Amino acid sequence: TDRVSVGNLRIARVLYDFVNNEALPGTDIDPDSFWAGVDKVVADLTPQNQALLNARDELQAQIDKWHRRRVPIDMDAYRQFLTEIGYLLPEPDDFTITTSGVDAEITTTAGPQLVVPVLNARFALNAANARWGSLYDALYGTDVIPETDGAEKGPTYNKVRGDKVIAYARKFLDDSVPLSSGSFGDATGFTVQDGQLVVALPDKSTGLANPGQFAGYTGAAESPTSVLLINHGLHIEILIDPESQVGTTDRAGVKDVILESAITTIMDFEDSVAAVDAADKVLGYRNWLGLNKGDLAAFLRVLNRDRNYTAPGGGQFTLPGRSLMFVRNVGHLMTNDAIVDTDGSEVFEGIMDALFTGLIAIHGLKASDINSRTGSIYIVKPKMHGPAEVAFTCELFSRVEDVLGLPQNTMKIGIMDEERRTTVNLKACIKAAADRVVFINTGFLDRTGDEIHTSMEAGPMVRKGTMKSQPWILAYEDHNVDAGLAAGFSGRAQVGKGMWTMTELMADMVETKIAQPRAGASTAWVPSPTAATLHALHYHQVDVAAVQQGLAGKRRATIEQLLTIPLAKELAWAPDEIREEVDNNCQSILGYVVRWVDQGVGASKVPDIHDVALMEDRATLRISSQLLANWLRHGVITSADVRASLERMAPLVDRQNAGDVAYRPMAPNFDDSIAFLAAQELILSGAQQPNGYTEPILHRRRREFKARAAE
C-alpha cells in the first residue's frame, strides 16, 4: 500500500488522488491548505479522542467491579455510585437550542426518514429519489393488501388485488383530505374552478372540507393531469390519466396516488456498510460526492429534478424532488489505515469522515444540476457516550469548517441517543451542541447493545424478544422526547425514533409504527423507499405538531427507571427456550457476518429462527453477540452449546445463500472459514470488546479475508 507524505501523515494513494482530483475541484480550496489542515487537525485532536476512549474503558471497569462485588439491587447506591465516578452528571438548567440555518425538511416537516448504505449507489439513488413514491405500488407489491383468495400477486396484473389497492387509497384520501360531503370512493372527476378544487360525485359536486388542503395541480385546470394536495405538511398527488391501464377501470380515471415519502435520507458510512481500507472508504466517498454534485448515475438511473405545479390561484411553483440528505459519519471508536503516521499508527476514522464528508458536502450547496437550500451540512454522529463526547464532536466540526473555508456552525449534527451514558445525560449532550444540534434519535438496537454490555457483570439478561418491553427502554424512548421538546425541538429540530427491521412485514409496520408519531416523534427510520411511502400514511393520521404541544413540560421517566437493568428472573427459562434463543442468535450472527467478511456487505436481510426476514447491521449483531456473551458469562449456556449451535445453523446459512452466486460456504470446514471464526470470536470474545462494539473484530477479519484472497 503506497502512501503520500503530508507532514506526520502517510495518506494512502487512492484516497490522496481521489480527494485531489475529484473532491477538491470546484470548492476553491487549495490542495496544500487542505492536506495541511488534515495534518494539523489530526495532530491536534487525536489526543482527546483517545482520552475519551480510555474514559469509556475506565468507567466500564468500575461498573464491572461494582457489580462483581454485590451479593438484591439497591438502586440508590448504584445511582450514588455512578454519580461519584462521573458516569451520571448534573442536569443543566433548562435552555433552548439556537441552531440556525436549518432546512424546512428538518425544522418543520414531520415524516419518514430513510437510511441507506452509501456504498450501494443503486440504493443511494433510490433513497434520494424516495421523496416521492407510488402508493399503489407500495400497497400492491407488499402484504398491506393481504394475498387472500383472488387478490394474490401474480406474474401479470391482478385486478382483484388492484381494486383493493384503489379502495385502500380512497379511504386514505377520505381519512386525510376529506370532502364536504361524500367519499373519494364515489368520485367521477376533478376540476379546479375559481381557484378551488371541485370533485364530481354521481349526483352532485363537492369541494374539500378544508379547501386550504388544496395545493395545486398540473395540466389544464378544466381537466387536470393531476391534483396536488397537502395535509400535515406532507404532499399527496392524485395522478389522473383515464387511458392508463389502471386508470381506465377507475371511476375517476385515477392512475396512482403519489405520496411525499422520504422527507430526509441518511447516507450511511457506519453500521450498514463494510469499509475497512482506503479502497472501501473511497467507494463510499465517491458515491457521496456524486449525490452532492447531482450526477450519481447507474441501466442509466439518475437523480430526479424538482417538480413543477400550478398554484390554485393560477401561478407557478416548484417543490423539492429529492430527499434532503444527511450523511452518517462513523463515531469516535475506530481507526482506519487509509491514513497512518510516521510511527505507522492508524488514524481515527471519525476525524477522517468529518474532513472528507464535509469537504464533499460543499458541492451540495452549489449549482451542479443542490441539497440544503439554507446553507447547512447535516452529519449524523453515532455512538457517543456522554456530553464531553458531544463537545468533542463540536470542536472537531469547528476545526474542519475553517480548514474548509465554511462559516462556523455550518456542519450541523444529528445526535444519536444510542449509548447508555448518553441516555442518562441526554440534556447535557443536547446542551453541548445547542447551536449545532439538528436532531436527536433513539438508536434502540445500539442502545440495547450498550445496555447489555454495561451491566454484563450484574447477571443474565432477558431474551432479545423481551427487550422491546423492558422498563428501561420504555423510559428511554419517553425521556428522549421530553428532553427534545424541553430544549425547544418543536419547529427547530427533529425528534426521531428507530428502525423497522422487518422488511417484508408491511402490514405489521403500517399497523405498529404509528406508535412513533403518536409518541411525539416528528421523524422515524424506514429501511426502503417503499417502507417510506407506507410510513408516510402514519403522519397523515397523526398530527405530530399537536402531539408535541400536548407533551410540553411533561417529565415522564425517572432516572431510577432509566437505570432499570433488564436482568432475568431466577430459573426463568426452560431448556428448549434457551436452545431456541441461542440457535436464533447464532443464525442471525452467522448470516450477517458471512456476507460482511466474505463480501463486504454491511447490511443484509437475514431470516431469524422463525424465518422472519430481518435487515441486520452492526447494531443488531451487537445485540445478538452481546446477549450470548452474557448468558456465557453467567452460566446459562456452555462453550460447547455455542460451538454446537454455530455448527448447527451455519449449513442452514450457506443454504439460504442459495440466492447468491460466487459465495464461499462455511460448513463443513469451520476452522477454514474466516467468516465462521469471526462469528465465533464475536461471541466468545464478546465480553472484552469495548462497550460491546463489533467493528474491531469485523474490521480485522474482513482485512484478513481480503489478504487471503491475494494469492
Ligand X SMILES: Cc1cccc(Br)c1C(=O)C[C@H](O)C(=O)O
Known binding positions for Mg(2+): 418, 446
Is residue 384 close enough to count as binding Mg ion by CB under 5 A? no
Site for ligand X in 298-317 (CB under 6 A): none
Say if CB 284 and CB 338 are below 8 A apart.
no
Shortest Cβ distance from residue 485 to ligand X (Å)?
22
- Please identify which residue in 617, 654, 681, 695 interacts with ligand X, judged by CB under 6 A: 617
Of 249-257, 362-370, 614-622, 630-638, the segment contacting Mg ion by CB under 5 A is 614-622
Among the residue ranges 90-98, 336-344, 441-449, 473-481, the one whose residues contact Mg ion (CB under 5 A) = 441-449
The least distance separating Mg ion from the CB of residue 338, rounded to whole angstroms, comes to 22
For 140, residues 6+ apart whose C-beta sits below 8 A from its C-beta are 153, 161, 162, 165
Measured distance CA(259)–CA(131) in Å, rounded = 8
Taking residues 489 to 528 in sequence order and writing x for each that binds ligand X by CB under 6 A, - otherwise, the string is ---------xx-x-------------------------x-
The site string for ligand X over 401-440 (x = CB under 6 A, - otherwise) reads -----------------x----------------------
- Identity at 212, one-letter amino acid code: G
- Binding site partner of 272, from ligand X, Mg ion, none, Cβ cut-off 5-8 A by kind: ligand X
CB count within 10 Å of CB 210 equals 12
The single residue of 286, 328, 420, 421 carrying the catalytic annotation is: 328
Cβ of residue 201: shortest distance to ligand X, in angstroms?
A: 45
Report yes or no: 402 and 395 within 8 Å, Cβ to Cβ.
no
What does the buried/exposed string (b/e) look like for 663-681 if buried means 16 or more CB atoms within 10 Å of the residue's CB?
ebbbbeebeebbbbbbbbb
Segment lying near ligand X (by CB under 6 A), choices 240-248, 284-292, 403-411, 617-625: 617-625
- Rounded Cα distance, 360 and 400, in Å: 12
Selected from 271, 417, 457, 581, the binder of ligand X by CB under 6 A is 271
Candidate ranges 182-190, 477-485, 515-523, 611-619; the one touching ligand X (CB under 6 A): 611-619
User: What's the CA gap between 284 and 267, in Å, rounded?
Assistant: 9
Using CB under 6 A, count the residues that bind ligand X. 19
The three grid cell numbers given for residue 711, joined into one nine-digit string: 494469492
Contact status, residue 418 vs residue 476, Cβ threshold 8 Å:
no
Q: Which residues of 385-411 are buried (b: 16+ CB within 10 A; e: fewer)?
A: bbbbbbbbbbebbbbbbebbbbeebbb
Cell of 432: 453541548
* Binder of residue 115, out of ligand X, Mg ion, none (CB less than 5 to 8 A by kind): ligand X
- Give how many residues touch Mg ion by CB under 5 A: 4
Three cell numbers written together for 626:
452481546
Kindly tell me which of 619 and 683 has the beta carbon lying closer to Mg ion: 619
| CA dihedral angle for residue 675, residue 60, residue 420, residue 469, rounded to 10 degrees | 70
510 touches, from ligand X, Mg ion, none (C-beta below 5 to 8 Å by class):
none
Sign of CA dihedral 258, 490, 412, 115: negative
Extract the annotated binding site. Answer: 115, 122-123, 272, 301, 328, 418, 443-446, 527
For residue 360, the minimal CB distance to ligand X (Å) is 20
Residue selected from 119, 173, 458, 615 as contacting ligand X according to rule CB under 6 A: 615
3 state DSSP class of 347: strand
Q: Measured from the CB atom, is 256 or 451 closer to Mg ion? A: 451
In the complex with ligand X, the residue whose CB is nearer, 123 or 172, is: 123
Q: Is 450 in the site for Mg ion (CB under 5 A)?
A: no
Q: Does 331 bind ligand X (CB under 6 A)?
A: no
3-state SS, one letter per residue, for 444-479: HHHHHHHHHHHCCCCCCECCHHHHHHCHHHHHHHHH
- Per the CB < 8 A criterion, the answer to whether 422 and 454 are in contact is no
Min separation Cβ 705 and Mg ion, Å: 24
Query: Is 617 part of the annotated catalytic residue set?
Result: yes
Nearer of residues 272 and 599 to ligand X, judged by Cβ? 272
Q: Does residue 446 bind ligand X (CB under 6 A)? A: yes
* Grid cell at residue 348: 481515527
One DSSP character per residue, 623-650 reads HHHHHHHHHHHTTSS-HHHHHHHHHHHH
564 vs 560: CA distance, rounded Å: 7
The distance of closest approach from Cβ of residue 504 to Mg ion in the complex, given in angstroms and rounded to an integer, is 22
Give the binding range for ligand X (CB under 6 A) out of 23-31, 267-275, 335-343, 362-370. 267-275
Contact pick of 331, 443, 484, 517 for ligand X (by CB under 6 A): 443
Shortest Å, Cβ 385 to ligand X: 14
112 binds ligand X (CB under 6 A): no
Of 256, 271, 617, 654, the catalytic one is 617
Residues 398 to 427 in contact with Mg ion, rule: CB under 5 A: 418
SS3 at position 412 = strand
* Cell numbers linked to 202: 354521481
Give the nearer residue to Mg ion in terms of CB position, either 206 or 624. 624
When CB distances are held under 5 to 8 angstroms depending on the partner's kind, the choice from Mg ion, ligand X, none that residue 312 binds is none
Q: Closest Cα to residue 334, out of 279, 281, 284? A: 281
What is the C-alpha separation between 353 and 349, in angstroms, rounded? 6
Contact 597, 697 (CB under 8 A): no
Among 329, 335, 454, 620, binds ligand X (CB under 6 A): 620
Of 499, 676, 710, 655, the residue nearest 586 (C-alpha)? 676
Q: 448 vs 533, which CB is nearer to ligand X? A: 448
For ligand X, give the closer residue by CB, 6 or 521: 521
DSSP 359-381: HHHGGGGS------TTS-EEEEE
**How far apart are the two ends of the chain, measured CA to CA in Å?**
16
333 contacts ligand X (rule: CB under 6 A): no
Q: Which of 377, 400, 534, 619 binds ligand X (CB under 6 A)?
A: 619
**Three-point CA angle 284, 286, 290, nearest 5°:** 115
Q: Is residue 364 part of the contact set for Mg ion (CB under 5 A)?
A: no
443 binds Mg ion (CB under 5 A): yes
Respond yes or no: is residue 163 known to be catalytic. no
Of 131 and 332, which CB lies nearer to Mg ion in the complex structure?
332
Q: How far is the CB of 416 from Mg ion (least distance, A)?
A: 6
Catalytic residues: 328, 617
- In the complex, which residues of this chain contact ligand X (CB under 6 A)? 115, 268, 271-272, 382, 418, 443-446, 498-499, 501, 527, 603, 615, 617, 619-620
- In the complex, which residues of this chain contact Mg ion (CB under 5 A)? 418, 443, 446, 619
